[PDB]
């Protein structure tokens, strides 16, 4: 099966663009990354940075995750992110999202060896 690390890349990484360029970014990306296959995932965040810079966050500031776990890490720097949130007209299989572009610190949970991001916790 797909590894947790691979799933994080699929769900959260977009190193191919620097920022969302149009209001349709989330509709396109949620569909193309197969996040709407079974149901409309209600919220998702894409990170517009190199995979290496995001993996490096697992060696930065240790913080508690929202759910209390202590394998979360906050990035020292802000990063380019896109927030995707389901709209009121969203109806499976035609899932619909609002695109919001922002520059925030990210918080990820890390696991494994190599120690890599496997869950996106929050942006602050």
UniProtKB/Swiss-Prot annotation:
It is found in: Secreted. GO terms for molecular function: lyase activity; nucleic acid binding; ribonuclease A activity; RNA nuclease activity. Disulfide bonds join 26-84, 40-95, 58-110, 65-72. Keywords: Disulfide bond, Endonuclease, Glycation, Glycoprotein, Hydrolase, Lyase, Nuclease, Secreted, Signal. One of its GO terms (biological process) is defense response to Gram-positive bacterium. Substrate binds at residues 7, 10, 41-45, 66, 85. Its main location: secreted. Its EC number is 4.6.1.18. Pancreas. The active site is at 12 (proton acceptor), 119 (proton donor). GO terms for cellular component: extracellular region. It is an enzyme of class 4 (lyase). Glycans are attached at residues 1, 7, 34, 37, 41. It catalyses: an [RNA] containing cytidine + H2O = an [RNA]-3'-cytidine-3'-phosphate + a 5'-hydroxy-ribonucleotide-3'-[RNA]; an [RNA] containing uridine + H2O = an [RNA]-3'-uridine-3'-phosphate + a 5'-hydroxy-ribonucleotide-3'-[RNA]. Belongs to the pancreatic ribonuclease family. Interacts with and forms tight 1:1 complexes with RNH1. Dimerization of two such complexes may occur. Interaction with RNH1 inhibits this protein. Monomer. Endonuclease that catalyzes the cleavage of RNA on the 3' side of pyrimidine nucleotides. Acts on single-stranded and double-stranded RNA. This is Ribonuclease pancreatic. The gene is RNASE1.
């Amino acid at each position: 099966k797909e590894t947790a690390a691979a799933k994080f890349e699929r769900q959260h990484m977009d190193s191919s663009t620097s920022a969302a360029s149009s209001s349709n970014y989330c509709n396109q990306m949620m569909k193309s990354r197969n996040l709407t296959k079974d149901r409309c995932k209600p919220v998702n965040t894409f990170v517009h940075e190199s995979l290496a810079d995001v993996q490096a966050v697992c060696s930065q500031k240790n913080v508690a995750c929202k759910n209390g776990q202590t394998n979360c890490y906050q990035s020292y720097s802000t990063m380019s992110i896109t927030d995707c949130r389901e709209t009121g007209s969203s109806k499976y299989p035609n899932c619909a999202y609002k695109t919001t572009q922002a520059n925030k610190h990210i918080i990820v949970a890390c696991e494994g060896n190599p120690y890599v991001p496997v869950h996106f916790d929050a942006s602050v």
